[PDB]
Write an enzyme that holds these catalytic residues in place. Sequence first.
Site, PDB file in Angstrom:
ATOM      1  N   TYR A   1       7.899  -5.734  99.964  1.00 26.65           N
ATOM      2  CA  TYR A   1       8.780  -6.959 100.319  1.00 26.65           C
ATOM      3  C   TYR A   1       7.641  -7.775 101.015  1.00 26.65           C
ATOM      4  CZ  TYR A   1      12.631  -9.532 102.245  1.00 26.65           C
ATOM      5  OH  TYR A   1      13.690 -10.679 102.310  1.00 26.65           O
TER       6      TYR A   1
ATOM      7  N   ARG B   1      15.669  -8.786 103.613  1.00 24.59           N
ATOM      8  CA  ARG B   1      16.385  -7.780 102.808  1.00 24.59           C
ATOM      9  C   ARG B   1      15.896  -6.430 102.703  1.00 24.59           C
ATOM     10  NH1 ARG B   1      20.590 -10.608 100.575  1.00 24.59           N
ATOM     11  NH2 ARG B   1      21.408  -8.337  99.804  1.00 24.59           N
TER      12      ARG B   1
ATOM     13  N   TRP C   1      17.954 -19.815 102.229  1.00 24.16           N
ATOM     14  CA  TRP C   1      16.840 -19.508 102.863  1.00 24.16           C
ATOM     15  C   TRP C   1      15.314 -19.959 102.335  1.00 24.16           C
ATOM     16  CZ3 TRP C   1      18.095 -16.705 106.810  1.00 24.16           C
ATOM     17  CH2 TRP C   1      19.076 -15.965 106.809  1.00 24.16           C
TER      18      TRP C   1
HETATM   19  O1  LIG Z   1      13.820 -15.968 104.270  1.00 19.78           O
HETATM   20  C1  LIG Z   1      14.318 -15.368 103.295  1.00 19.78           C
HETATM   21  N1  LIG Z   1      13.854 -15.326 102.148  1.00 19.78           N
HETATM   22  C2  LIG Z   1      12.765 -15.928 101.527  1.00 19.78           C
HETATM   23  C3  LIG Z   1      12.199 -16.901 101.980  1.00 19.78           C
HETATM   24  C4  LIG Z   1      11.121 -17.684 101.483  1.00 19.78           C
HETATM   25  C5  LIG Z   1      10.709 -17.335 100.041  1.00 19.78           C
HETATM   26  N2  LIG Z   1       9.764 -18.012  99.708  1.00 19.78           N
HETATM   27  C6  LIG Z   1       9.195 -17.134  98.161  1.00 19.78           C
HETATM   28  C7  LIG Z   1       8.288 -18.288  97.352  1.00 19.78           C
HETATM   29  C8  LIG Z   1       8.808 -19.579  98.305  1.00 19.78           C
HETATM   30  C9  LIG Z   1       9.897 -19.295  99.175  1.00 19.78           C
HETATM   31  O2  LIG Z   1      10.638 -19.953  99.530  1.00 19.78           O
HETATM   32  C10 LIG Z   1      11.373 -16.182  99.593  1.00 19.78           C
HETATM   33  C11 LIG Z   1      12.708 -15.477 100.275  1.00 19.78           C
HETATM   34  C12 LIG Z   1      15.400 -14.538 103.744  1.00 19.78           C
HETATM   35  C13 LIG Z   1      15.489 -13.941 104.966  1.00 19.78           C
HETATM   36  N3  LIG Z   1      16.628 -13.040 105.378  1.00 19.78           N
HETATM   37  C14 LIG Z   1      17.462 -12.595 104.589  1.00 19.78           C
HETATM   38  C15 LIG Z   1      18.526 -11.885 104.831  1.00 19.78           C
HETATM   39  C16 LIG Z   1      19.539 -11.224 103.797  1.00 19.78           C
HETATM   40  C17 LIG Z   1      20.383 -10.322 104.363  1.00 19.78           C
HETATM   41  C18 LIG Z   1      20.406  -9.665 105.475  1.00 19.78           C
HETATM   42  C19 LIG Z   1      19.374 -10.148 106.400  1.00 19.78           C
HETATM   43  N4  LIG Z   1      18.563 -11.135 106.149  1.00 19.78           N
HETATM   44  N5  LIG Z   1      17.318 -13.186 103.300  1.00 19.78           N
HETATM   45  C20 LIG Z   1      16.363 -13.885 102.677  1.00 19.78           C
HETATM   46  N1  LIG Z   2      20.589  -9.057  96.486  1.00 20.09           N
HETATM   47  C1  LIG Z   2      19.117  -8.967  96.134  1.00 20.09           C
HETATM   48  C2  LIG Z   2      18.367 -10.076  96.224  1.00 20.09           C
HETATM   49  C3  LIG Z   2      16.814 -10.247  95.707  1.00 20.09           C
HETATM   50  C4  LIG Z   2      16.041 -11.410  96.189  1.00 20.09           C
HETATM   51  O1  LIG Z   2      16.532 -12.582  95.445  1.00 20.09           O
HETATM   52  N2  LIG Z   2      15.331 -11.286  96.992  1.00 20.09           N
HETATM   53  C5  LIG Z   2      14.282 -12.537  97.187  1.00 20.09           C
HETATM   54  C6  LIG Z   2      13.587 -12.289  98.428  1.00 20.09           C
HETATM   55  S1  LIG Z   2      14.589 -12.249 100.143  1.00 20.09           S
HETATM   56  C7  LIG Z   2      13.239 -13.009  96.057  1.00 20.09           C
HETATM   57  O2  LIG Z   2      12.792 -12.050  95.672  1.00 20.09           O
HETATM   58  N3  LIG Z   2      13.126 -14.151  96.014  1.00 20.09           N
HETATM   59  C8  LIG Z   2      12.005 -14.867  95.297  1.00 20.09           C
HETATM   60  C9  LIG Z   2      11.900 -16.435  95.559  1.00 20.09           C
HETATM   61  O3  LIG Z   2      13.048 -16.900  96.288  1.00 20.09           O
HETATM   62  O4  LIG Z   2      10.917 -17.180  95.406  1.00 20.09           O
HETATM   63  C10 LIG Z   2      18.674  -7.824  97.048  1.00 20.09           C
HETATM   64  O5  LIG Z   2      19.375  -7.495  97.896  1.00 20.09           O
HETATM   65  O6  LIG Z   2      17.391  -7.269  96.785  1.00 20.09           O
END
Ligand SMILES: O=C(Nc1ccc(N2CCCC2=O)cc1)c1cnc(-c2ccccn2)nc1
Ligand SMILES: N[C@@H](CCC(=O)N[C@@H](CS)C(=O)NCC(=O)O)C(=O)O
Lengths: 198, 198
Positions: free
Chosen positions: B7, B13, B103
């Site tokens: 992660y 997550r 996010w």
């Molecule tokens: O900040 C999050 N995600 C995130 C941010 C940035 C990026 N990057 C990837 C490349 C460009 C970019 O924007 C990817 C994922 C996040 C933080 N908490 C949670 C979350 C969900 C469920 C329970 C608790 N917390 N879900 C998502």
């Molecule tokens: N419901 C899925 C969500 C998976 C997901 O979309 N994860 C995000 C990170 S929080 C991801 O890989 N995002 C890539 C991006 O936004 O560039 C889980 O619980 O694992």
Amino acid sequence: PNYKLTYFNMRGRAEIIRYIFAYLDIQYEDHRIEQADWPEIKSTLPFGKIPILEVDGLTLHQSLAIARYLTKNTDLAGNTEMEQCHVDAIVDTLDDFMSCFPWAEKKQDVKEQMFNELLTYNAPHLMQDLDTYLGGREWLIGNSVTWADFYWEICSTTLLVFKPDLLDNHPRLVTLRKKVQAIPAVANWIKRRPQTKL
Amino acid sequence: PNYKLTYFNMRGRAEIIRYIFAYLDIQYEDHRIEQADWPEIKSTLPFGKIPILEVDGLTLHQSLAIARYLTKNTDLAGNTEMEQCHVDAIVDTLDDFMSCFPWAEKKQDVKEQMFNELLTYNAPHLMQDLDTYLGGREWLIGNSVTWADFYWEICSTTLLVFKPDLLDNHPRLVTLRKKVQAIPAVANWIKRRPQTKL
Ligand SMILES: O=C(Nc1ccc(N2CCCC2=O)cc1)c1cnc(-c2ccccn2)nc1
Ligand SMILES: N[C@@H](CCC(=O)N[C@@H](CS)C(=O)NCC(=O)O)C(=O)O
Ligand SMILES: O=C(Nc1ccc(N2CCCC2=O)cc1)c1cnc(-c2ccccn2)nc1
Ligand SMILES: N[C@@H](CCC(=O)N[C@@H](CS)C(=O)NCC(=O)O)C(=O)O
Ligand SMILES: [Mg+2]
């Protein structure tokens, strides 16, 4: 058990539950409410969402929670704990995609172009990922049908309404849809269910 | 088995999985990547998303599918099949809300406005529903802690970053947080984990 499923007159998030009941030969009340009924019903629900399933006077909620409950200890679950995890993870991957669509959203400036953005740009990546994951296998997980196969067919039906060329580069994914639809219990349900758009 | 969790360096997550490994006192490799690593990691993943959990060379994906897999046959699962359905339903209700947040939104002003709107207009209905569901009971489901209680603590920790007064009208939900945080193995993890905003 005495089962009462409540949802709109729609396939939607209840259809997975309906397929499982059909496949298992389980009798149930398929309660479909009118939009004008909703406000007063909503007050009584635990988190104000449907579907709900009433089981012997007890209320369950969350479509996939209820679906997993119903398929526990059946042949739809996955044949190992690890394969059960794969089933849950495919369902959640599909559900994550479906839940990104603005279904309730009024504003058809954003709604339409948000749909079209999700369908034009993201859906094909998902389709290619599902195809690759499936490979040459008959079913998504293991050697037999699971409720993840059901969810694929259900999710892909609604997607094909809005993007009918979705599967033109993925014959193997079409075949899996047809395989599910050909399961006699499923076919029977599909033939006799209310015809609705979604 | 040998476990490797991949992660970002963030709770996010992955944190539900990390709480479960801590609570069960199971060793694992906590692989945290930087943005820079993302394209190379992603190319390996089944559905373009993290977290993944590699278990003796095979990949699991989807945070909640993984958490369910890890808690199966443990005291964190829910003591009956109906309680297990309730665990799943509460988790999905929380996850559905967390999934609404933008996010990854690049425009900061648009991101902050949507966060503030969700937390002001939408969150209170959820917090009230959760409080009503919990009533005076010790834990969300059954008579002992489940991974639903963990996910409540994890979700509410991140929401409180952006809305400090989130739980001011719900002291029983604060108490539940404190009880999860006081479990010794969880308290230890909380004290030891990398400190990240999210
Ligand atoms: O900040 C999050 N995600 C995130 C941010 C940035 C990026 N990057 C990837 C490349 C460009 C970019 O924007 C990817 C994922 C996040 C933080 N908490 C949670 C979350 C969900 C469920 C329970 C608790 N917390 N879900 C998502
Ligand atoms: N419901 C899925 C969500 C998976 C997901 O979309 N994860 C995000 C990170 S929080 C991801 O890989 N995002 C890539 C991006 O936004 O560039 C889980 O619980 O694992
Ligand atoms: O259309 C949906 N939901 C919906 C519509 C309308 C409204 N309200 C009521 C009247 C006007 C309004 O905005 C609320 C919810 C829907 C249908 N299928 C799916 C769905 C999910 C998962 C898999 C497949 N399909 N998800 C959502
Ligand atoms: N993740 C939930 C979603 C439940 C949900 O949000 N259902 C919608 C209809 S598809 C609803 O009841 N909305 C009612 C409202 O918010 O007023 C599930 O799968 O059951
Ligand atoms: Mg979900």
